[PDB]
Amino acid sequence: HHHHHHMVHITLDRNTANSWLIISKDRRQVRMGDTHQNVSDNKERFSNYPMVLGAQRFSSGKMYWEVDVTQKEAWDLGVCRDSVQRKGQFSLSPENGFWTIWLWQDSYEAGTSPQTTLHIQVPPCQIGIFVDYEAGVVSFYNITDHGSLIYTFSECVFAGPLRPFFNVGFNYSGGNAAPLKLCPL
Ligand SMILES: CC(=O)N1CCC[C@H](CNS(C)(=O)=O)C1
Numbered sequence: 294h295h296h297h298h299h300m301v302h303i304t305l306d307r308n309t310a311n312s313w314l315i316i317s318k319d320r321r322q323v324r325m326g327d328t329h330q331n332v333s334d335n336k337e338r339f340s341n342y343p344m345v346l347g348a349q350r351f352s353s354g355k356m357y358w359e360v361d362v363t364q365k366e367a368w369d370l371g372v373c374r375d376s377v378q379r380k381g382q383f384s385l386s387p388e389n390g391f392w393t394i395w396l397w398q399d400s401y402e403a404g405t406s407p408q409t410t411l412h413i414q415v416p417p418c419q420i421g422i423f424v425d426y427e428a429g430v431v432s433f434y435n436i437t438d439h440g441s442l443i444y445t446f447s448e449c450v451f452a453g454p455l456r457p458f459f460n461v462g463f464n465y466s467g468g469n470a471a472p473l474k475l476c477p478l
Pocket residue numbers: 311312313325340341342343463464465
């Protein structure tokens with residue numbers, strides 16, 4: 294692909310983070326902590342899942358960023374509406390304001406309803422995410438496999454400002470402690 298020129302500098306918003314997450318000082322990395330991270334509760338925090346939003350809000354234009362997923366067993370990545378539900382149980386779907394892909398139990402899937410099987414021959418260590426607000430497009434690219442397309446959501450109905458969306462996943466296995474990292478431009 295040739296979307297690299299729409300690269301944007303994404304930072305994580307501490308105030309949206311589940312209370313067990315540890316966001317690095319530069320706001321470019323996030324990982325699961327082994328306990329509550331000693332923060333007060335607020336209405337922005339994701340309560341049920343290890344999720345956090347980017348600080349940036351997008352309402353127009355073309356945007357591109359890259360995320361490092363090296364050695365993780367489980368994660369969700371993409372964009373979501375600024376107004377997504379924060380508390381309680383919910384599914385990742387366009388109907389709920391999310392445009393995401395994920396890794397879970399050795400399979401990759403797109404967050405449609407119901408979910409769609411992805412066909413990845415080269416397990417990605419970095420994922421590229423492209424958003425075209427006007428076109429209603431969210432695309433995912435396998436940076437490890439020369440930028441090969443993973444999935445395109447088209448005819449998206451964003452219906453509001455978008456924020457970068459992250460889930461570091463649970464670490465019940467002891468094999469999913471590694472961080473999500475926003476890769477340099
Ligand atoms: C992320 C979160 O809200 N919580 C609360 C309940 C217990 C969970 C245990 N953490 S785990 C999967 O072992 O890494 C962590």
